[PDB]
Every structure is written in structure tokens, then in C-alpha cells.
Design a protein around this motif. Structure first.
Motif: not given
Ligand SMILES: OC[C@H]1O[C@H](O[C@H]2[C@H](O)[C@@H](O)[C@H](OCCCCCCC3CCCCC3)O[C@@H]2CO)[C@H](O)[C@@H](O)[C@@H]1O
Length: 265
Positions: A10-11, A13-14, A16, A247, A251
């Protein structure tokens, strides 16, 4: 929080970006979680732990003393010298330099110590001597943080770095006192340690060294565990993300949260 591996995904994908992670038992070396663990990431200031391990090896051999005072000049300073810029008149001991590098991320301190171990080539040779055939240092502070896409300079892999940290802390390559010193420097981190404690549940041990570089590069090399014990090494690197520092920190913290919520594996 979801399972660790799910959170790591998920990290990516968030952000990139690519994340590299390993979670390893400190005492045994058992690998618990691995994600991109054989891929290269810039070390950034995480290299300072290995650097100080090389210094300690010299101390154990009688080739260095943590007491020895090094006098240096203003023209030796590079960007971000919070401790070392204060000691142009009186110098710093080798041990003080180690503490400034690991606990404050003082860049000039790191370069001064790098000089004592033969520069980037000397530190790379030390890595090969302890059986790390992958990690490499090529440049000095601060160019080593450039994090050019695809550039192998100044990189490690999560698996390499975790194994190397375990070797330095526990394998009896370093003397008992030296192992204890390296650990205490990481316990004493002032950059991230106190912030991390403020957000850890009661009972969780932390020791760490962080790093930051270009193109989103960010990392941490840590000892973590419940019951106030350094149970596991956790190595997390991020690269090639345009995200805010906030961010990226969130993450990395979220991966930590996933580990804490799902610790027994
Ligand atoms: O049930 C487990 C725990 O769940 C929460 O704890 C949260 C905590 O409130 C939050 O602040 C933290 O964020 C994670 C902070 C981790 C930051 C450092 C991580 C480093 C450490 C190792 C290297 C990689 C990253 O997550 C935990 C787990 O959800 C509860 O607050 C706490 O009472 C409870 O004991």
C-alpha cells in the motif's frame, strides 16, 4: 493496520515509489519479512552505523582510540555540521565524532571519520572483510545522498544492511565493549528516536539511524521490540517517490504500525 506485507504494498501504491524492507530477529538472524530485500537503495546517513563499526574495529585492534582528539579546519566542513561546527577551536574526540554522526547525523563528523578508515574505498573494503559483498560506499557527504535513478553508488540492499548490522552488533567481530558502544549510539539518536518514542506504545524499545536523500530517498535502520527488548532489526528504504517528507515519514511509520499490530509471526 493491515498485515506488514500488505502495508508495504500500500505504501508503494500511495508513494509511487519503491520500498525495500526487511524484519530480522537480532539474536538469530531469522528473516521474518522481506520485500525487495535484494534490490539496491541509497544508504544515505544510514551508512554512519557501518562507518562507526569500522572505527570500532580499529579501536579493538589498537589502531585507534575513541579518546583521540581530532583537530580540523572550517574548510573541512560540509553541509549540516550541528556539532562539529562548534569545535573548530578545540576539536572533537573520535568517539564524539561517532556520537555526532549517529545521534545528530552530523555530516562533517561522518567525513572526518571516513577519512580515518580509508575513505569510501576503505569502508567498502571493511564491508567485504565482514562478508558483505553487496553494500558499497563510493562518495563522501553530502554527494552520497544524490540518489540518481539506477545509480549503484552508495547503495545497500535491505538484506545486506540487516545482516551487516547484526554482524556488527552481535557476532563478536567487535569486542564486547565495542558492540555495547555501537548499540548505545543508536539508542541515543536525537534526530528520530525521541519522536518515535512519543508515538510508540508503552513497552516498545527503539534504537535507530535514519537517512534522507533526493528523489524521495528516505530510510531507517532500527532495533525494535516489545517488553523493552531489542528483539528485531527493521530496515526500511524508500526511493524514487515525489511525495512530501511528511508523507514518506507517515508511510514508514505505517509499516511500523503494521509490525506492532501483527508482531507474533
Ligand atoms: O494494539 C497495539 C497498539 O496499537 C496502538 O498503537 C499504535 C500507536 O498509537 C501509533 O502511534 C503507532 O504508530 C506507528 C509508529 C511507528 C514509528 C516508528 C517505526 C520505525 C521502527 C522500526 C524501523 C521502521 C519504522 O502504531 C501503533 C500500532 O498501531 C495503540 O495506540 C496502543 O495502545 C496499542 O498497544
Amino acid at each position: 493496520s493491515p498485515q506488514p506485507l500488505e502495508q508495504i504494498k500500500l505504501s508503494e501504491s500511495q508513494l509511487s515509489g519503491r520500498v525495500g524492507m526487511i524484519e530480522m530477529d537480532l539474536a538469530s538472524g531469522r528473516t521474518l519479512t522481506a520485500w525487495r530485500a535484494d534490490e539496491r537503495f541509497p544508504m544515505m546517513s544510514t551508512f554512519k552505523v557501518v562507518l562507526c563499526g569500522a572505527v570500532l574495529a580499529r579501536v579493538d585492534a589498537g589502531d585507534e582510540q575513541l579518546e583521540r582528539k581530532i583537530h580540523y579546519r572550517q574548510q573541512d566542513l560540509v553541509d549540516y555540521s550541528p556539532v562539529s561546527e562548534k569545535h573548530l577551536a578545540d576539536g572533537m574526540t573520535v568517539g564524539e565524532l561517532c556520537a555526532a554522526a549517529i545521534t545528530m547525523s552530523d555530516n562533517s563528523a561522518a567525513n572526518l571519520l571516513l577519512a580515518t578508515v580509508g575513505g569510501p574505498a576503505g569502508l567498502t573494503a571493511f564491508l567485504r572483510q565482514i562478508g558483505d559483498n553487496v553494500t558499497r560506499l563510493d562518495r563522501w557527504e553530502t554527494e552520497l545522498n544524490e540518489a540518481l535513478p539506477g545509480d549503484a553508488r552508495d547503495t545497500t540492499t535491505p538484506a545486506s544492511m540487516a545482516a551487516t548490522l547484526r554482524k556488527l552488533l552481535t557476532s563478536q567481530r567487535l569486542s564486547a565493549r565495542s558492540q555495547r558502544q555501537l548499540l548505545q549510539w543508536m539508542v541515543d539518536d536525537r534526530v528520530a528516536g525521541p519522536l518515535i518514542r512519543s508515538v510508540l506504545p508503552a513497552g516498545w524499545f527503539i534504537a535507530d539511524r535514519t537517512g534522507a536523500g533526493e528523489r524521495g530517498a528516505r530510510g531507517i535502520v532500527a532495533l525494535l521490540g516489545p517488553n523493552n527488548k531489542a528483539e528485531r532489526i527493521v530496515v526500511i528504504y524508500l526511493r524514487d517517490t515525489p511525495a512530501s517528507m511528511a508523507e514518506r515519514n507517515q508511510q514508514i511509520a505505517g509499516i511500523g504500525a503494521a509490525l506492532i499490530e501483527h508482531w507474533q509471526r
